Design a protein around this ligand. Structure first.
Ligand SMILES: [K+]
Ligand code: NA
Length: 426
């Protein structure tokens, strides 16, 4: 089950980073608590379990101290975690202590024991991912017990963000596999499906496009992918939008309205496949008999997106990359600047959205080799030429997954020309 070599390497990386940047990124914490809810959203806590152990551990609390790691979990998970005791000892000198919770027990006594151990290891500062809302009885109780302890509590989300920021070669491979499928689905299913639907003047709901796209992702054979299907999931329900109803937030959901493709129309599709828990993303906009404003805006958006990608190089600030897009729009379409999305995307990995790596004007984080980005840039609520049209107000979106290498930036969702002529239909 558990890759012990990966566990050791990553536990060492974690303890090293924690120690190296204790005050700066880890809130001066002496101990760090992570907790995952019962099976049911992306959680940074879930990402840590996946990163460290290669599997989710729902309804589990894990607490790292200088010399121990305490886990509160089911007997079944505890029998599994027995195997990492020796590797944890031999890697960072820590003792794994397993506290088994009975199914009908609330785990209260074990939480008290864990809290006593934290105190023993020595005031105490416990780091947690503060922005996470506890879900379920276990996490509710734990949060209350931490709150009611004497401990100082520090947000350490930025520590985990830094830790997950630069991917190993293995992780980059999984993202490329994911991105290959993502791109293959867009190119070999979505584009073909849309073309057929518009050709035959079919009626199809956005939610049907969503479901059909899901099916192809989960059976990548349906587009000749050759990825182990057991390793594939969807990052989010595919997004299809048209007919004047757009929403560029990543949480947008495909509605039950029919795809709209009459004159002066645009269609937005965003899809992302996940491979061995590593996410990828792509988004394309297709234009049907586009009017001059829709056409120009798309050309400008493409040039702006390419400018972000071209600016994501080791040593450059994420903010400079975002402002590269702004500079393009300011030059070529100054009146459209106000419609540009305020973000050009985020880091991406186990988490679909790495919030600490948001490509925006306020993020002065420096690009490093091994970072991976969902470069996703749009125009929101532009006005088309004929205001009597269904797309009187419209939006546009382009997204790709890129890998930052030392010597070049790889666009791993490259599936063919994004130029207007290739995404426009008449
Ligand atoms: K329209
Ligand atoms: Na529509």
């Amino acid at each position: 089950s558990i890759d012990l070599n990966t566990f050791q390497t990553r536990l060492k990386a974690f303890y090293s980073h924690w120690d190296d940047r204790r005050t700066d990124l880890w809130g001066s914490s002496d101990a760090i608590a992570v907790a995952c809810p019962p099976p049911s959203r992306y959680l940074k806590s879930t990402a840590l379990f996946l990163w460290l152990l290669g599997f989710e551990f729902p309804e589990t609390i894990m607490v790292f101290t200088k010399k121990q790691i305490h886990v509160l979990c089911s007997q079944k998970k505890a029998s599994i975690l027995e195997s990492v005791k020796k590797p944890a000892r031999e890697s960072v000198g820590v003792e794994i202590i397993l506290h088994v919770k009975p199914k009908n027990d609330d785990g209260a006594s074990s939480m008290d024991a864990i809290i006593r151990a934290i105190r023993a290891q020595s005031s105490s500062t416990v780091g947690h991912i503060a922005r996470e809302e506890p879900e379920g009885r276990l996490l509710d109780l734990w949060a209350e017990k931490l709150k009611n302890s004497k401990f100082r509590l520090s947000d350490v989300a930025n520590g985990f963000s830094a830790l997950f920021a630069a991917k190993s070669n293995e992780e980059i491979t999984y993202i490329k596999r994911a991105a290959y499928l993502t791109g293959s689905v867009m190119k070999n299913f979505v584009v073909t499906k849309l073309e057929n639907v518009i050709d035959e003047e079919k009626k199809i709901l956005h939610s049907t496009l969503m479901e059909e796209t899901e099916k192809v992702i989960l059976d990548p054979a349906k587009v000749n992918c050759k990825l182990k299907a057991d390793n594939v999931d969807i990052c989010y329900p595919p997004i299809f939008q048209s007919g004047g109803k757009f929403d560029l937030r990543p949480s947008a959901v495909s509605n039950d309205e029919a795809l709209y493709y009459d004159s002066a129309s645009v269609i937005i599709c965003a899809v992302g496949a996940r491979y061995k828990s590593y996410c990828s993303n792509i988004a394309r906009t297709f234009l049907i008999d586009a009017d001059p404003i829709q056409s120009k805006a798309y050309e400008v958006l493409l040039k702006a997106q390419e400018a972000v990608i071209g600016s994501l190089k080791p040593g450059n600030k994420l903010s400079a990359a975002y402002l590269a897009a702004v500079s393009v729009v300011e030059k070529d379409a100054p009146d459209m600047v106000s419609c540009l999305t305020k973000s050009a995307g985020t880091g991406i990995g186990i988490e679909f959205r790495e919030s600490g790596l948001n490509i925006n004007a306020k993020n002065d984080q420096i690009v490093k080799e091994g970072m991976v980005f969902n470069v996703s840039l749009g125009f929101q609520n532009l006005h088309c030429e004929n205001s009597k049209s269904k797309n009187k107000v419209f939006s546009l979106l382009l997204a790709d997954t890129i890998i930052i290498n030392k010597d070049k930036t790889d666009v791993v969702t490259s599936i063919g020309s994004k130029a207007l002529k290739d995404v426009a239909y008449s």
